Design an enzyme around this catalytic site. Structure first.
Site, short mmCIF file in Angstrom:
data_model
loop_
_atom_site.label_atom_id
_atom_site.label_comp_id
_atom_site.label_asym_id
_atom_site.label_seq_id
_atom_site.Cartn_x
_atom_site.Cartn_y
_atom_site.Cartn_z
N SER A 126 28.40 6.66 76.31
CA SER A 126 29.16 6.48 75.09
C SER A 126 30.51 7.10 75.30
CB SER A 126 28.45 7.15 73.93
OG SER A 126 28.42 8.54 74.12
N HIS A 140 36.07 2.28 71.49
CA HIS A 140 34.76 2.90 71.49
C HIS A 140 33.80 1.95 72.18
CE1 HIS A 140 30.74 2.86 69.60
NE2 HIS A 140 30.77 4.10 70.06
N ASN A 142 29.46 1.92 73.83
CA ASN A 142 28.22 2.61 74.09
C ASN A 142 27.23 1.59 74.61
OD1 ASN A 142 28.28 1.50 71.28
ND2 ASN A 142 26.13 2.07 71.48
N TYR A 143 26.38 2.01 75.55
CA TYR A 143 25.30 1.18 76.04
C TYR A 143 24.11 2.09 76.30
CZ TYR A 143 28.68 -2.46 76.14
OH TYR A 143 29.60 -3.42 75.66
N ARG A 144 22.94 1.70 75.81
CA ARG A 144 21.78 2.58 75.87
C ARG A 144 20.47 1.81 76.00
NH1 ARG A 144 23.54 1.91 70.80
NH2 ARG A 144 22.00 1.46 69.18
N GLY A 293 23.68 4.94 64.49
CA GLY A 293 23.99 6.28 64.00
C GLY A 293 24.27 7.17 65.19
#
Lengths: 336, 336
Positions: A126, A140, A142-144, A293
């Site tokens: 992130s 911004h 993010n990868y998860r 979140g």
């Protein structure tokens, strides 16, 4: 010839969170593939940012905790191009807390305990990058990935991620470039992904009380668990690889643009909006590494160097201020 | 001779939220007494601030909504003394939402419905004032009252409130003056109130991850429902009347103090901490008008004009920066 894994690892910001002996034993495990992807992405992004900004160095903090996993936090502050840039990775193993488990049930997830426990792994990258120049936009991404072991040899897993742009003023070429890059990445994996995730991004970063979005969107996805683990990984990999080409060209193009004190002022107000999205609508969740979140650590990493908050006279009807407000209220298509 | 109520009302920032005909009919009702108190307090504070700051005017917005009650929001922005000052009042009547009701049960409150409903009234004043000068401290205060009608002629009621100081650097005289003023107000109503509420304030504004408090405290109380409604009101009245003497002298003393760019920088970092308390620990609750936790409107009103966030080298061991950090981590007694 250099060992393939060793060669990969020499290019990372720091050694992997997971013991290298474990990654070596299980090259085909999705946890291995995803940890290497997030490390690669972090390195690619930091290297690109460092090449652009000669004014500051990354501090690289590879950390661990007994209950909270480990990670690598890379931070640049008060450079000549970026006022703040953060690129972090986290890898957590353990058993799901009763609280974490409970929350997932609320979102309609049904977990069957293995023994009495829910062994899990969550990981992700992130990043928030805030240029100094009003004309160079904030990004911004993010990868998860999350997996939990259930009763039987059954596993529940999902990916999430996204990439979104927060310009100070609207620039049509920039917006198209950014979105086009994301769409091309998504389209490789099916034609309905970009339109779905573009809309999801428009809906998610809504600062509800102003009726305005944080920025001009991009893509957002969550709970992505089909069609197959390998197929979703390849999609996420394409998205992660699109960050640098989607963004660094915009910064290189605009980092030297002239600006007025008024444009700087407007940037500061736009940076205050960025912060306000967290303040009002995304204040912190302990389970943010595997659900929409943000965790506290992420929220902190996202804060700009400076921001402003001030109740504002409606701008001139054909001003650039008015134009960006209109698009934040009524998002547009950027690529078809 | 002027009518007593009419005379009171001519001194307010705007007319009461509640119909004046209703206040006239029920002069002895606690809802009447508390609405007049919050209006008086708002006017006293705004008048004192306006006398100090010749650089900006208050905008006064008396508003109403069908479901959300009404209020009077007074805002000053970018003055010669105050960069931001907000003093608001809200008065809401209605029936408690199932959600609101549910939450109170979680906090151990037991409500018995009248008919099928829970008629209630909540009101309060709340204010955040941010001086421009690094040496003039930020203040926050709030005073509120809630009642709900239950089965039988039974009513459940409580007050809450507080007053707390957020200095940029520690000034011993200022800290003592502020706390002494609050203690004198509390002591009038019993000797255990200030020590209890002083400790509560130290505990409540804890920015947990830094192990630091927002500022140097003051008083904080919630769920105050004993010994009697009139006695608690008189206490709250004393506290509300202490705001101006606790604070305006500090601003008048320090608003012209010389400061360095470094002291301004530190102020900006301290203002970022103020914001961070909300970001992490107090992001918004819809029921904030009658429980700890701020409503979105309150959080917005509290934001400073500007703030800074930046990872900071530990300051010199005997510096003023080090001193304030130490007291934020380890609160001290200021008056005994």
């Amino acid at each position: 010839e250099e060992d393939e894994l060793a060669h990969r690892c020499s290019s990372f910001m720091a050694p992997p969170v997971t013991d290298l002996g474990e990654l070596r034993r299980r090259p085909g495990d999705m946890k291995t593939k995803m940890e290497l992807l997030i490390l690669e992405t972090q390195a690619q992004v930091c290297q690109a940012l460092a090449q652009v900004d000669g004014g500051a160095n990354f501090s690289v903090d590879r950390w661990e905790r007994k209950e909270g996993g480990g990670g690598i936090s890379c931070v640049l502050q008060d450079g000549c191009v970026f006022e703040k840039a953060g690129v972090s990775i986290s890898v957590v193993h353990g058993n799901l807390s009763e609280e974490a488990a409970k929350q997932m049930r609320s979102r309609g997830k049904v977990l069957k305990t293995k023994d009495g426990k829910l062994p899990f792994c969550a990981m992700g990258v992130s990043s928030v990058i805030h240029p100094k120049n009003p004309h160079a936009p904030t990004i911004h991404f993010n990868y998860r990935y999350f997996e939990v072991e259930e009763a039987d040899g059954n596993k529940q897993w999902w990916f999430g991620g996204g990439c979104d742009l927060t310009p100070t003023y609207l620039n049509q070429e920039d917006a198209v470039h950014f979105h086009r890059t994301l769409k091309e990445a998504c389209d490789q994996h099916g034609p309905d992904l970009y339109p779905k995730f573009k809309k999801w991004c428009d809906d998610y970063f809504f600062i509800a009380h102003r009726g305005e979005r944080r920025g001009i969107g991009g893509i957002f996805f969550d709970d992505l668990d089909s069609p197959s683990k390998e197929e979703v990984f390849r999609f996420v990999q394409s998205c992660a690889r699109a960050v640098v080409p989607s963004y660094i060209p915009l910064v290189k193009k605009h980092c030297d643009d002239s600006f007025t004190p008024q444009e700087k002022l407007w940037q500061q107000l736009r940076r205050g909006r960025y912060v306000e999205f967290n303040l009002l609508y995304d204040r912190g969740t302990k389970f943010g590494l595997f659900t929409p979140g943000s965790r506290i650590e992420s929220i902190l990493m996202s804060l700009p160097l400076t921001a402003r908050w001030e109740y504002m006279h409606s701008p001139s009807e054909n001003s650039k201020e008015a134009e960006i407000l209109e698009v934040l209220r009524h998002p547009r298509d950027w690529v078809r």
